[PDB]
Design a protein around this ligand. Structure first.
Ligand SMILES: NC(=O)c1cccnc1
Ligand SMILES: NC(=O)c1cccnc1
Ligand SMILES: NC(=O)c1cccnc1
Ligand SMILES: NC(=O)c1cccnc1
Lengths: 251, 251
């Protein structure tokens, strides 16, 4: 896998762009300035071996970059990146990790450390599978944890209910590993949105399978729980990219 | 109106972010580097009075920032910013001015010159209405011109057909002023999408009113012409934000 060019600049650029202009009305500005955020982010993996990281490596960074989240707009998703973000509509309906400062900054970027100066590899980065999980998921895992930890009020989770190989809810999806377990008592409810991809055999349904397990698990953490399959607002979104779909026939 | 803070940085940050990571697959990278683009952009209004600009002021900037545009997918819009961009889907379906380098960089930013050093005002900018049009629309007007001039093949135009005070097509909308008149012979057709806001009296219709005028006007410039009212892909998008709407009733 090839690392992102001019990581420093891309980071700082994205950071500044965010600071001054991005979710001015949806999310709070962070207190630390970009150079400070860069240092916290760099020390986390610089001059260490690419696989030399754990959930704590970016702790300082995430502490500096964590913004308070608006009650009720936090959204989590699993295996439905495009659908979840379209529905979230760039912080308008729900915010996603990708909409927060840390997420927006590192979204899609590729980087890794090396022990030799300059401290990070600019030619190549190890493959996912090469490193132990705690290093492999050190950044996005922590990001997800910090994010989830900050959720207030109702929280929303969109999952793929049409994937025969992957249950809607899984104890070891980033959600199951870092998001759900880190929801604080500030969280009120967990509303689930099950997505049934168009023209696809339905695999998961509310009150059944992993959704049924999640429900117990959620009420266990003492939160209210909701669940809906293809709510119209969302269905229509799916229909847009595939109008002919049988499930979109107009009255 | 208050100017954008750290204009320089925001501009350069946005610029770099774009360069390295933004529409890698949809749009070509520009040849000039960010510092060069900044100089062309700054000279255009720096050390002049806020109202001291004309269609030519940013000519150099736009020349350097103009990317070649994908055949058949350039989209233009009028009074339907949100609907047009959602449908365009960030360059996935159609690209819009805001998806191009110049647009992405200056989108939503506020700036103006002043004659005293540093050359631009950081406290306040004059109101739209205060300056002569050629200065007032110097930047976005030029941007629109340059953009339109680069369109090839089929071109798409989305308009509001539900606005009693503003006809779908107007000789003096930015489209009518800078986009339509600048379409080159590289343009094949002009497909129009009339938007009929949900639960709103329909005002304009294809083959009628301003749409009828546009049609003549288009065939005049020797382009083929299409027109559709609330095509399903788009209708569904409207329905997403308002499911109860009568026009969204499911079969
Ligand atoms: N940048 C990414 O690839 C990514 C993937 C999944 C969740 N958050 C970020
Ligand atoms: N190699 C990578 O792209 C990467 C991304 C995010 C966190 N850790 C590693
Ligand atoms: N995107 C914009 O800045 C813009 C400005 C004026 C008219 N239409 C769009
Ligand atoms: N930044 C601005 O105030 C501005 C005004 C008019 C056209 N382009 C930019």
């Amino acid at each position: 896998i090839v690392p992102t060019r001019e990581l420093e600049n891309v980071f700082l650029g994205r950071c500044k762009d965010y600071e001054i202009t991005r979710y001015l009305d949806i999310l709070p500005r962070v207190r630390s300035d970009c150079s400070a955020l860069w240092k916290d982010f760099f020390k986390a993996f610089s001059f260490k071996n690419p696989c030399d990281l754990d959930l704590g490596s970016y702790k300082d960074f995430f502490t500096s970059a964590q913004q308070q989240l608006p009650k009720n707009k936090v959204m989590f998703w699993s295996g439905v990146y495009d659908e979840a973000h379209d529905y979230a509509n760039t912080g308008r309906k729900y915010i996603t990790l990708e909409d927060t400062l840390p997420g927006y900054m590192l979204n899609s970027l590729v980087w890794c450390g090396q022990r030799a100066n300059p401290g990070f590899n600019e030619k190549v980065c190890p493959d996912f599978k090469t490193c132990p999980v705690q290093a492999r998921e050190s950044f996005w895992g922590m990001a997800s944890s910090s994010y989830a930890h900050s959720a207030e009020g109702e929280v929303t989770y969109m999952v793929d209910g049409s994937n025969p190989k992957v249950p809607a809810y899984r104890p070891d999806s980033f959600f199951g590993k870092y998001e759900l377990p880190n929801l604080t008592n500030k969280v009120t409810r967990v509303k689930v949105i099950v997505l049934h991809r168009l023209g696809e055999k339905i695999i998961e349904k509310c009150g059944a399978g992993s959704l049924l397990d999640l429900e117990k698990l959620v009420k266990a953490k003492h939160f209210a729980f909701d669940c809906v399959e293809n709510p119209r607002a969302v269905l229509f979104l799916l229909c847009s990219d595939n109008p002919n779909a049988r499930e979109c026939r107009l009255a």
